[PDB]
């Protein structure tokens, strides 16, 4: 929950790469430097793409992070994100995240990117009905039933997956930007009632 007294960054963040990320974020001299909960409370954004991070253990102590860039790492477990109540924008492309249950109570999350994670089962995304942007390109998804609950989506990429049935998108009236290239789609009837689309890409299907 909280760091009660000042503690070395090295001790809170066991992943050597993530400890260095925190050191640089707070402009500290060394991962041996001690930080207070007050200093950790000052972190609202972490930029740590392409950083060879295997674990974000310790991030639980950053209650005020709203923007988290973790594209291109070696993550499989996002349980340390479970109680980051203020997370708004989350980028996790090119990891290997399959268990999405830790996203369930991220109720301020507006944007989620999980491209190229090898995902097939997205049932757990049903618990994010407030999402506005969702990027799932380059995965192994077939069944998008649960996206019918995500009635606030305005941007959705499902390109380069295994989808043939897009009926669950029929009621997503707020969609503006929809990317469906490189799937198995022949029948777009269910999209006929979407009135607010600016972008709809359907290139290169394999029927």
């Amino acid at each position: 929950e909280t760091i009660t007294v000042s503690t070395p960054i090295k001790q809170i963040f066991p992943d050597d790469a993530f400890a260095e990320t925190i050191k640089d974020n707070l402009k500290k001299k060394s991962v041996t430097d001690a930080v207070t909960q007050n200093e950790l409370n000052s972190i609202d954004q972490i930029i740590a793409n392409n950083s060879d991070i295997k674990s974000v253990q310790g991030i639980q102590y950053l209650p005020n992070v709203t923007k988290l860039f973790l594209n291109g790492n070696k993550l499989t477990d996002i349980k340390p994100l479970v109680n980051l109540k203020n997370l708004g924008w989350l980028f996790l492309d090119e990891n290997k995240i399959k268990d999405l249950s830790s996203l369930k109570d991220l109720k301020k999350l507006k944007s989620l990117s999980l491209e190229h994670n090898g995902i097939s089962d997205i049932n757990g995304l049903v618990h994010l009905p407030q999402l506005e942007s969702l990027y799932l390109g380059n995965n192994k998804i077939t069944d998008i039933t649960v996206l019918s609950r995500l009635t606030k989506l305005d941007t959705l990429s499902l390109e380069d997956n295994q989808i043939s049935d897009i009926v669950p998108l029929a009621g997503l009236t707020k969609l503006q930007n929809l990317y469906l290239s490189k799937n198995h789609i022949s029948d777009l009837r269910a999209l006929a009632g979407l009135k607010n689309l600016d972008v709809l890409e359907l290139f290169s299907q394999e029927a």
Partner: nanobody
Framework: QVKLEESGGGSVQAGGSLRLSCAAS????????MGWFRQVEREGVAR????????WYADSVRDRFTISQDNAKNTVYLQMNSLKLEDTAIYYC????????????????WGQGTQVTVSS
């Protein structure tokens, strides 16, 4: 390998006008977001969906600036009218495939920047 070629800028008198251009090369996108940020921390100014029609403007420039595109030419244009002292800044062309991510800046392709100075 995405390249942003910026044209336009310099000094202008308050109340005057300036038009910036930015052309994107080396990409495959059917549609994408392109526009400008500025830095007087860097802030978004104007965005358009190249290959679509949606736009976004910062509140401070909304009705004075107009962004447009030549889709086939992969170029966007920023017509800056009724220029104000508050508009002096370095202006950066910038691009992302997805408009909502474009707004964050962090993941965008970035141009070199052009100096705009509004006097009097």
């Amino acid at each position: 390998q995405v390249k942003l070629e910026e044209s336009g800028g310099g000094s202008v008198q308050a109340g005057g006008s300036l038009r910036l251009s930015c052309a994107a090369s080396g990409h495959t996108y059917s549609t994408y977001a392109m526009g400008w940020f500025r830095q007087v921390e860097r802030e978004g100014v104007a965005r358009i969906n190249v290959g679509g029609s949606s736009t976004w403007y910062a509140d401070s420039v909304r009705d004075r600036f107009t962004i447009s595109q030549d889709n086939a030419k992969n170029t966007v244009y920023l017509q800056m009218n009724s220029l104000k002292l508050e508009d002096t800044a370095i202006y950066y062309c910038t691009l992302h495939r997805f408009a909502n991510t474009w707004s964050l800046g962090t993941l965008n392709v970035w141009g070199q920047g052009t100096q705009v100075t509004v006097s009097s």
